[PDB]
Amino acid sequence: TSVKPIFSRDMNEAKRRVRELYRAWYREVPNTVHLFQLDISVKQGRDKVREMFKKNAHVTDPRVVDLLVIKGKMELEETINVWKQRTHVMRFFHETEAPRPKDFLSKFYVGHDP
Amino acid sequence: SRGEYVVAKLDDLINWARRSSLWPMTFGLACCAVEMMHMAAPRYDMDRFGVVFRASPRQSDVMIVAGTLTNKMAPALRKVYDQMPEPRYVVSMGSCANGGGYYHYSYSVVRGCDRIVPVDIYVPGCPPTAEALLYGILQLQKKIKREKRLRIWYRR
Amino acid sequence: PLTLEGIKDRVLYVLKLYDKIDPEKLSVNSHFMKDLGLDSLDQVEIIMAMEDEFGFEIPDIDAEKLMCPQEIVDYIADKK
Amino acid sequence: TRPTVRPRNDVAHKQLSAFGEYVAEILPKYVQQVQVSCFSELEICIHPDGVIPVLTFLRDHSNAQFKSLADLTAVDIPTRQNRFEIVYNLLSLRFNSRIRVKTYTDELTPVESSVSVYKAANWYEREIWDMFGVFFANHPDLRRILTDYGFEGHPFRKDFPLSGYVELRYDDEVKRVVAEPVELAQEFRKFDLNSPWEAFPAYRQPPE
Amino acid sequence: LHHAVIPHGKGGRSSVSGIVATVFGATGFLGRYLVNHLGRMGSQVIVPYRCEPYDTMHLRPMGDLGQIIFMDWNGRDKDSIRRAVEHSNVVINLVGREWETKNFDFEDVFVKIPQAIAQVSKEAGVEKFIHISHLNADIKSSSKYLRNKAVGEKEVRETFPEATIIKPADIFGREDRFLNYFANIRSLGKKTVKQPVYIVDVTKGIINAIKDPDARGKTFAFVGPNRYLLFDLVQYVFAVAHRPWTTRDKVERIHTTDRTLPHLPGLEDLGVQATPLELKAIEVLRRHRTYR
Ligand SMILES: NC(=O)C1=CN([C@@H]2O[C@H](COP(=O)(O)OP(=O)(O)OC[C@H]3O[C@@H](n4cnc5c(N)ncnc54)[C@H](OP(=O)(O)O)[C@@H]3O)[C@@H](O)[C@H]2O)C=CC1
Ligand code: SF4
């Protein structure tokens, strides 16, 4: 499996490109949250940005890390333009509950569930 | 009962003035738009009934949702719908729009336009015939004939 | 005027102004990656926060290689 | 036989066999299979490292113009080492002939994005990036086309099911359109239609 | 419990829950957002109306395929109310016009309407009839509104005593009334302490009260944790707005008080998180011209 690379030869440029992506997302929040006329503080949106980076801790392969950086760069293009809208950014937020449980007791009463 | 008689007369007047024209907007996504264009045919006129094409949404009386609504389109559909004169009506034209139809499954189709807007007048078909569309507009006018708006307002 | 003292004091108050510094706990031998429990996410937050406040462009390898307030004070007192 | 059976050609089949053998000889570097079916349209089947060389050679060399492009499709097949199949389909203007140029690839290894020799393939390449995931190196813009913005998954796969993982409706609580896990109103009763008794005996692979 | 009343599957959009709701009112504000959360929950809502059908068409896209259903009644009859409460698992009572029409006073709406409907609700054998009430509805003077709601509390406690009386404070939301009157300006100096409560935490408390037993008999209260002054709230609402058929029972209400009662449990005891007024006030403080 001597696979062709994408962007990085090892994990070093992978970490460098994803930290550059996170740099762009930190400096990308206030312009969009002031432009799109949202209802949410800047710090809460930045915390969901860092939470979405925290979701992907198990990602190992350099192809996959580079492909996540490609997806993030494409979405940052579509959010530095207004191709997307308020609906999509509020769809990144999960506000309209859906308070769907995790306890086995609450998976038992409200049941037919694992 | 001079007060309620005057209220009944004036409510009948304004309801007649409502049901006269009903100029729509030319929304028309897919080939039910082509059926709308053939409801703009000489053999089946709409300007006999004051149904006149007025492309700007802020003065159209009804909205004829026609063509397959998708998820990429639906925010544009409602953000057109939400800015309009305060009486507003929806004619859902075609099996795509009024319950999904042939694409009722298959992602990025809203399962009928009931999930986005309130829908008064359904006309089903693939396509609906132009004769059926004009019958739907006539039954919309009869819904306008039974408003009793100012009667409800006065006996409130 | 742009010696070590004003730079270190302004780094001091903007780290105090930083949000999730837990606790404040500032040191010139801090090394908050493996001594204070602050992740590399928070590391790059701090570095381009300094960039946003008063620093230079701080390119990505030198934005990676500070790791500690001592090298921050030294580099901004170096180039400026 | 004489009616009701579509008659086959002979000399066009001979010429396409000769031309496929011609191409297969004069490019020993990128050739695995050439084949002709009964309806006489040429097929070339290619390792994915000479895509721009084969398309430049099949645009020029003056005994094969083939100036018209079609469809690119990386038609998804499971079970294989290389799922995805890039399928070019070319038509010539001076010749009246049809070739299919099928090169193969897997889920992650990119190909060289042949937009620089055929300008038609730009939106095709963007579309097949959005629907499959065959990444395209040396390409100007990879945006998303035929999909929603906030939607992802490359939904023409056999992993993504028929109905989606997303559903949209409206609420007046926050006055906007929200997403939900999907709730079908009907089962989509799938029809088992796999007949017994050897539908075509001529296509019997060697049994394991 | 009958078959096909039992709950099923994941929540929302054909999740046939253990409630069959019958809502009175709901053409206005709070009942409409309550039907919004019920269609989010996915039950069948029987709602009547005597109005023009615009608002009931407006709340048509809420439920699933053919779930919600509409009928008619008036403040004269008994047959239509009985027809509404023929087969109802849960039933709620929101009612009240904040000004005097020529035939419905502030008198006899809170007297004549909850009596008949709550009586035929007990005579239909329903469980957990819920009735709203304002905070500090006292027999004490200077409040026709609050004393008529106190008489309504007395009547509902008299017939079917184990009905759930719910009292929140003033409700700020998306289509608020008192905060609209706060915004409705263009010289006066007064003070009275006051704390409001947000509408979606209120209705989450409503649905937790309607599907969580041990709740009956004892009345519940729903107040936000604010506890500050009217003058600070006027400064707040005009700093966010960036500006320099109505009666004076409105101004009596907003200069009355907001006092607490430690006898009855509230938000955290019932188990729903209370949200302050900050970003929801940023929501509901629109209409200003070019500062956004
Ligand atoms: N914070 C609190 O605790 C407060 C609670 N409330 C209560 O909460 C509810 C909603 O509040 P609010 O915004 O003020 O009012 P709403 O406009 O939202 O609701 C009042 C409802 O009462 C109906 N109604 C009133 N009189 C009649 C009648 N004679 N015949 C038929 N229907 C009638 C109205 O119907 P329609 O519009 O079709 O005529 C409407 O559906 C009300 O029940 C109100 O008493 C009110 C204020 C403060
Ligand atoms: S209902 Fe039929 S005619 Fe109308 S848009 Fe759909 S496919 Fe076209």
Tab-separated table of N, CA, C and O in Angstrom, chain B residues 18 78 87-89 114-120 122 143 147 149 152-156, chain E residues 13 50-54 57-64 97 99 101-104 245:
chain	number	residue	atom	x	y	z
B	18	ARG	N	-61.737	41.128	-3.286
B	18	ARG	CA	-60.621	40.200	-3.154
B	18	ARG	C	-60.673	39.115	-4.222
B	18	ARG	O	-59.669	38.842	-4.888
B	78	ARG	N	-39.423	29.727	1.110
B	78	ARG	CA	-40.093	30.377	2.225
B	78	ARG	C	-39.654	31.827	2.389
B	78	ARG	O	-40.485	32.678	2.708
B	87	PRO	N	-52.916	39.391	3.314
B	87	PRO	CA	-53.606	38.188	2.840
B	87	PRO	C	-52.716	37.452	1.854
B	87	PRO	O	-52.152	38.052	0.937
B	88	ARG	N	-52.566	36.150	2.062
B	88	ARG	CA	-51.706	35.355	1.203
B	88	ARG	C	-52.289	33.958	1.099
B	88	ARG	O	-52.881	33.446	2.053
B	89	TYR	N	-52.165	33.365	-0.081
B	89	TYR	CA	-52.754	32.068	-0.358
B	89	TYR	C	-51.756	31.255	-1.157
B	89	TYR	O	-50.904	31.804	-1.856
B	114	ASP	N	-46.248	20.977	2.118
B	114	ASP	CA	-46.915	21.191	3.398
B	114	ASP	C	-45.930	21.386	4.540
B	114	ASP	O	-46.292	21.986	5.553
B	115	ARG	N	-44.699	20.908	4.397
B	115	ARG	CA	-43.688	21.026	5.436
B	115	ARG	C	-43.024	22.395	5.474
B	115	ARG	O	-42.150	22.613	6.321
B	116	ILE	N	-43.391	23.312	4.579
B	116	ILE	CA	-42.761	24.623	4.481
B	116	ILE	C	-43.773	25.744	4.677
B	116	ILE	O	-43.565	26.651	5.489
B	117	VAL	N	-44.875	25.700	3.941
B	117	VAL	CA	-45.842	26.793	3.935
B	117	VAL	C	-47.219	26.225	4.246
B	117	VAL	O	-47.463	25.020	4.076
B	118	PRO	N	-48.137	27.058	4.728
B	118	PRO	CA	-49.547	26.662	4.719
B	118	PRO	C	-50.080	26.635	3.301
B	118	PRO	O	-49.842	27.549	2.514
B	119	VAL	N	-50.808	25.577	2.974
B	119	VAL	CA	-51.253	25.334	1.609
B	119	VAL	C	-52.766	25.255	1.605
B	119	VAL	O	-53.345	24.326	2.181
B	120	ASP	N	-53.410	26.216	0.950
B	120	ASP	CA	-54.867	26.170	0.865
B	120	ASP	C	-55.333	25.257	-0.262
B	120	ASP	O	-55.955	24.221	-0.015
B	122	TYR	N	-55.120	22.736	-3.248
B	122	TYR	CA	-54.383	21.681	-3.915
B	122	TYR	C	-54.983	21.441	-5.292
B	122	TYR	O	-56.203	21.337	-5.420
B	143	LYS	N	-63.539	29.966	-1.841
B	143	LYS	CA	-62.974	30.148	-0.506
B	143	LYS	C	-62.928	31.624	-0.127
B	143	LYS	O	-63.168	31.987	1.032
B	147	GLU	N	-65.431	34.101	3.396
B	147	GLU	CA	-64.495	34.602	4.402
B	147	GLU	C	-65.176	34.944	5.725
B	147	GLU	O	-64.654	34.599	6.791
B	149	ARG	N	-65.107	37.739	7.203
B	149	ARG	CA	-64.083	38.428	7.987
B	149	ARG	C	-64.681	39.484	8.906
B	149	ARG	O	-64.548	39.412	10.134
B	152	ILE	N	-67.167	38.265	11.582
B	152	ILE	CA	-66.455	37.759	12.756
B	152	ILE	C	-65.881	38.909	13.575
B	152	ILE	O	-65.960	38.908	14.811
B	153	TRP	N	-65.354	39.930	12.896
B	153	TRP	CA	-64.740	41.055	13.598
B	153	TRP	C	-65.764	41.860	14.384
B	153	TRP	O	-65.470	42.337	15.485
B	154	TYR	N	-66.967	42.034	13.842
B	154	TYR	CA	-67.946	42.817	14.578
B	154	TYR	C	-68.599	42.007	15.686
B	154	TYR	O	-68.803	42.529	16.786
B	155	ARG	N	-68.937	40.738	15.434
B	155	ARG	CA	-69.566	39.977	16.507
B	155	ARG	C	-68.569	39.486	17.547
B	155	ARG	O	-68.992	38.908	18.554
B	156	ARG	N	-67.270	39.668	17.313
B	156	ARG	CA	-66.270	39.553	18.364
B	156	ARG	C	-66.570	40.517	19.506
B	156	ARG	O	-66.913	41.677	19.284
E	13	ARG	N	-42.715	13.660	14.063
E	13	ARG	CA	-43.105	13.309	12.698
E	13	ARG	C	-43.544	11.855	12.594
E	13	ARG	O	-42.763	11.001	12.156
E	50	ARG	N	-63.227	30.255	16.771
E	50	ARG	CA	-64.389	30.965	16.263
E	50	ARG	C	-63.989	32.084	15.317
E	50	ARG	O	-64.848	32.854	14.879
E	51	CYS	N	-62.706	32.179	14.986
E	51	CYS	CA	-62.176	33.294	14.227
E	51	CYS	C	-62.161	32.973	12.737
E	51	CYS	O	-62.629	31.923	12.290
E	52	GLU	N	-61.634	33.914	11.964
E	52	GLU	CA	-61.367	33.675	10.559
E	52	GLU	C	-60.283	32.606	10.437
E	52	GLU	O	-59.335	32.599	11.227
E	53	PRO	N	-60.394	31.681	9.470
E	53	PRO	CA	-59.472	30.534	9.450
E	53	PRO	C	-58.015	30.812	9.103
E	53	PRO	O	-57.280	29.851	8.889
E	54	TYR	N	-57.580	32.077	9.034
E	54	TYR	CA	-56.195	32.387	8.680
E	54	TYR	C	-55.196	31.820	9.676
E	54	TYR	O	-54.197	31.216	9.280
E	57	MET	N	-55.067	28.047	9.438
E	57	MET	CA	-54.239	27.665	8.298
E	57	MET	C	-52.769	27.916	8.604
E	57	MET	O	-51.905	27.136	8.202
E	58	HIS	N	-52.485	28.985	9.354
E	58	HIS	CA	-51.119	29.357	9.715
E	58	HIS	C	-50.464	28.295	10.584
E	58	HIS	O	-49.257	28.054	10.485
E	59	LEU	N	-51.244	27.647	11.438
E	59	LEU	CA	-50.718	26.549	12.232
E	59	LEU	C	-50.972	25.173	11.615
E	59	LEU	O	-50.628	24.171	12.243
E	60	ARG	N	-51.572	25.098	10.418
E	60	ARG	CA	-51.574	23.837	9.669
E	60	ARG	C	-50.216	23.197	9.359
E	60	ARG	O	-50.124	21.966	9.492
E	61	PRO	N	-49.128	23.918	8.948
E	61	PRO	CA	-47.904	23.177	8.589
E	61	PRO	C	-47.102	22.651	9.769
E	61	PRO	O	-45.920	22.327	9.620
E	62	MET	N	-47.716	22.585	10.944
E	62	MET	CA	-47.040	22.226	12.176
E	62	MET	C	-46.986	20.720	12.392
E	62	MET	O	-45.906	20.152	12.577
E	63	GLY	N	-48.141	20.067	12.389
E	63	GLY	CA	-48.201	18.642	12.609
E	63	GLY	C	-47.868	17.851	11.364
E	63	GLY	O	-47.559	18.385	10.300
E	64	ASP	N	-47.969	16.531	11.509
E	64	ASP	CA	-47.635	15.573	10.460
E	64	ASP	C	-48.827	15.435	9.514
E	64	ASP	O	-49.703	16.308	9.492
E	97	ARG	N	-59.173	37.772	26.529
E	97	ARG	CA	-58.885	38.948	25.724
E	97	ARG	C	-58.508	40.088	26.657
E	97	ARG	O	-59.198	40.335	27.650
E	99	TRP	N	-58.649	43.238	26.398
E	99	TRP	CA	-59.457	44.445	26.356
E	99	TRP	C	-60.918	44.042	26.245
E	99	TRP	O	-61.248	42.889	25.966
E	101	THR	N	-64.390	43.801	24.637
E	101	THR	CA	-65.243	43.898	23.467
E	101	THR	C	-66.634	44.357	23.895
E	101	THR	O	-66.933	44.496	25.084
E	102	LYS	N	-67.509	44.580	22.916
E	102	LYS	CA	-68.844	45.082	23.221
E	102	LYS	C	-69.752	44.036	23.854
E	102	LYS	O	-70.813	44.400	24.367
E	103	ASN	N	-69.371	42.761	23.839
E	103	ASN	CA	-70.190	41.719	24.438
E	103	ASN	C	-69.454	40.842	25.435
E	103	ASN	O	-70.110	40.238	26.289
E	104	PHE	N	-68.134	40.745	25.358
E	104	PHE	CA	-67.337	40.030	26.349
E	104	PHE	C	-66.608	41.070	27.187
E	104	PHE	O	-65.720	41.765	26.684
E	245	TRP	N	-56.778	49.635	20.706
E	245	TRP	CA	-57.443	48.912	21.783
E	245	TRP	C	-56.492	48.675	22.956
E	245	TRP	O	-56.049	47.551	23.185
